[model samples]
Target chain A: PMFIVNTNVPRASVPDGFLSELTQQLAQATGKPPQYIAVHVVPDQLMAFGGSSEPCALCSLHSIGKIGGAQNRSYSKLLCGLLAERLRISPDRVYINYFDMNAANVGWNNSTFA
Target chain B: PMFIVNTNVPRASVPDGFLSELTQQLAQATGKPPQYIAVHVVPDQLMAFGGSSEPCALCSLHSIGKIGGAQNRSYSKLLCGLLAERLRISPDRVYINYFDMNAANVGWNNSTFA
Candidate 1:
């Protein structure tokens, strides 16, 4: 079963050990081997500057530079690469969905998920 | 193949008779069934008072509020009535490219979904 774990941890507070702790806890609770886990630290100020209330729903805009600044591509790559190494799964099996704290509530203002 | 049944039943932990108990159990084993379940709850202190989190992402604020002490509409009626209850969906379907989450780090912070 796919599950979502959302926490309000501020981006600045995310230290090097945070993702390891998260993976440990999830592995213990699920009794399943930890395949992969994606951790995202969203800055509060990013959302504040985005002119919206929710920060998880924004779609990609490679050409546009808005309130969140350029996307965090390095963070994305590093996360996926690290997870693939640890999980023993092919890197092809890893999945990451990192929505900027500034984008989550953007399109829902006018559209439906369906 | 449309299927999503999320079960972090925080609301159901309280005094409510469980719905579709048998079906949910069977589905949990093999997975399937149940649609159209919705609920709304209170806003937390951080999300309510901190930088940018909407009290509720899905609604039309008929009026405004002072702080977190905003009025709670007849919660049930507000959610159901506000949803475009009977809107017509167009009879159009299109094939979409699928992206492998691992390989195509096409990066939200960067370019090209393909």
Candidate 2:
């Protein structure tokens, strides 16, 4: 699984140990192990939402299974809290795009994960 | 369409006018107008693949259509070249995740694109 976060919040404002905390939270949320997860935070970006450049984030979570239907609601609530607390990005300004990736499409170690 | 790039390369190493060039190149590749394209580069990241941190990238291209099947091969070539030329990331180390988004899920200006 991979979680990529893109936000307009300045990098300096990101609290220390945030990514580590996020990784742990994600592991619990997805019921997945941390060793197989990759988290990428790209802060201090030029982004806008709803016609404004205010503190906003566009996040993507790519994983196989554990996504879709009612499951997203819980994930949404958990993720919004993290963005709001750590990045000061309001929940309304955040958009989390979830990708239930195919195993054959995921590559590592010179081959596909499948 | 939105092109989001995450790379381990240093931000300062990225050349000027790279995004604009990419915008044009993507327009041609996807046959979409430039105005509808959004490009983002998040460089200087801590990312690793294949047991090594060597210059690598994970990119996502989100659009409503113009993806799937053999259409991806051309996009892969165009995108890898862009990453290689601008960020020095190798084609072998790059992964592009394509999202054929549902228009209703794409929100903008207080409503969705649909």
Candidate 3:
């Protein structure tokens, strides 16, 4: 349902208009409707990786389900590619944490989706 | 532990001083210390809800366990109330996804907190 991409690189460094582009891409990649996808391209965090913060990223995806196993590995490749190719961060420095959300734990429109 | 709130309205529109208040409240709510709480307030998203973008919000919380069942429900209420009251986004338009993180999958400080 949601995708959050965090990188130490400046927010200005993210290629222009990637948020919209990515929203559609993720919707297609995850087989959810574009309207159902919410993308958060976060700014630089006070974070470090491999003992250095030169340029690394942590990407996480959340959904009620259908976001792990083969699909996760596949999307990992896709996301890693996006981060590396567009963000110019090394693919090796990227870490993807794909999550399967619980409906009871998620609240939508004033009430629990559970 | 991390708390991320994504809203489609202008991030600038968020009421002042609420982030800090939220941090302390969430720290108490999640039973994690203030230092352990990292908060992210995302800007507007080109997201549509019910085919409209007037104003919508999505909130997600990630932590290494200690987040589920009644605990999850309580946090859900706490978050829904906060966004509804502070961000002024309708509790109905808000969505909160609480995740019980895998220790090995989360990186903090310099490396995976695991």
Candidate 4:
């Protein structure tokens, strides 16, 4: 599982150790190994959302299997809550894009896991 | 198709012509027109690989229909080679994560295509 949490929030809004906490959140949320997880944060994007410049984010979680409507819903709730808490953004302002992928299609360490 | 090519390479490391070439590469490789594709580059990341701080990258490619086991493999080769050639990093340090998604799930503009 990999999570890329990009946002319009300033980098300073991301507290120290947020990345480590996000890794744990993802591992626990997806029931996957921490070693299999990779997380990145891209902050301070300039964009408007719903006619407002409120702090907003676009997060993408890419993983194989174990992702469906219910799972993604839960993930959205958890991640949105976290972002809202940290960045003072409304949960509605955040869009978590979940990608449930084919195992054969994901690559790591320069080789396809398939 | 959408490509998010995030890397430890500084923004300065990226040549002005690279993103445009990448967009063209993606359009041709995925058989999708450039308009449907969204590309993002998050550069100057702080990440480690095999315990080394050498320039490395992680890219996530998300799309529908044209993505497959073979297709993703070809994409990995294209993306990793490009990153390595430009970033002065080995291809082994670049990981191209691919997500082949359900059409119903991917939203655009402001609504779901499904």
Candidate 5:
């Protein structure tokens, strides 16, 4: 599994054409259309939704499978590029995580090298 | 139940003595020592763990019970005061929500005045 997370951008303020631009970029990187991608605009305030007092957006993506050895690294780079371009933020500000399944099946074969 | 949420301040960057500082402030406002408060430092990247491409911190707090007619409002104000004073963010940037029970108990006692 692989993931990318970044913050400090407001969901309501995402540029009008940003989603399509992101989809295009993902397709180019993965050689597959970005159809299953899920995008959410979470509020900065938790109590805004009648729960917790924590101040942050709550979102997630699941059911991802490792494509190959280079797939995770390639995807992470591609995602950072898209985020930086769409959000007008630096690529250095983006965070990426990549992982594979472990033998025990109870823990992840994890790595967070930059 | 009364709740408060604020953002922009990094969890790891929070002052080393901030938790105790917050507990003291909560005690002063509620007339009870803070014990049940739960604080979390969610990373800014979802992929740092292996999930999504979204760029936001995910966090939540739950099981709050309304104290009185003034409790929610009072708590929100008190919370803003603390976050602003400690985190150095203005109160206007702080967001809040207050609620009382409404008919359908199946859903939240929904209201978002601010």
Candidate 6:
């Protein structure tokens, strides 16, 4: 599983070690192994929410089966909390898009997850 | 629709007008208006595939419709071509994950797409 965080905040402004912490936290939240948890922080992007550009994020969680209805609530709370604490992006300005990707569609090393 | 490209290539290394060109191409490919096409390039990420770190990308396409089994082949061709031409990332190292998001789940302007 991989969690990619897209924020308008500058990379330099983000607190150090936040990605490391996020990876650790997500492993617990998703019940996945640390080795399988991948986190990418894409900072300093052009973005707007609610007609304002103040600290907003669009995070994507790409996993196979660990996502769905009620499960999303758990992720939303923890993810929003982390983004707020580390990047100062409020829950109101954040949107998490869960993508339950089919293994066959994900390519890697000239092959696919399938 | 938003097409977010996450690449291991450096942002500075990317050619100019790539995003604009991509926006135009995707509008044609997806049959969506240019105004509705949002393209984000998140470059210089730490990534590895097959235990190699050579230029690679994980691109995500978030749209409501215009995506499915066969439709993906057309998109994959165009997107991978663009990535290779602009970022020097080969199609073999690129993976595009399509998310057919429900309107109600997407938030904007203090409200959901629904």
Estimated TM-score per prediction? 0.25, 0.61, 0.69, 0.71, 0.34, 0.61
TM-score of 1: 0.25
Pick the winner on lDDT between candidates 5 and 6.
Answer: 6
Kindly report the docking quality category of candidate 4. acceptable
lDDT (10s digit) by residue, model 2, range B9-114: 8889889998999899999988999999999987889565433467878877888788765556667777887777788777777777777889998988899989
> Which residue runs does candidate 6 get wrong by more than 4 Å?
B1-5, B11-42, B46-56, B61-95, B98-114
Instruction: Encode model 4's per-residue lDDT on A1-114: one tens digit a residue.
Output: 767767788888888777677777878999987666667777888877797888888778878876899999899988888887877888888887777766778765545767
Interface RMSD of 5: 17.9
Residue B69, model 5: lDDT of 38
Model 4 TM-score (2 dp)? 0.71
Candidate 4 per-residue lDDT over residues B59-81, each given as its tens digit: 77888878777777777777877
True contacts kept of 5: 0.00
Summarize candidate 6's per-residue lDDT along A1-114 as a digit string, tens digits. Answer: 678788899988788777677778888888877655657777888999898999999888888678998888999999999998888888999999997878655544344455
Report how far residue B9 has shifted in candidate 3, in Å.
Answer: 5.6
Candidate 6 lDDT over residue span B1-114, tens digit each: 899988789979988898899899999988989988999987888554323457778778888788776667677878887787788887877777777789998888899879
Which residue pairs in model 4 clash with each other?
none
Candidate 6: which pairs clash?
none
Off by over 4 Å in 2: B1-5, B11-42, B46-56, B60-114
Estimate, for each residue in A18-38, the C-alpha lDDT of model 2 and write its tens digit.
767777888888988765566
Badly placed stretches (over 4 Å) of model 1 are A1-71, A101-114, B1-114
Prediction 5 TM-score vs. true: 0.34
Clash list (residue pairs), candidate 2: none
TM-score of chain B of 2: 0.95
**Candidate 4 segments whose C-alpha is farther than 4 A from its true place:** B1-4, B15-41, B45-55, B60-66, B88-93, B99-114
| Deviation (Å) of A109 in candidate 5 | 45
- Model 3 residue B97 lDDT score: 83
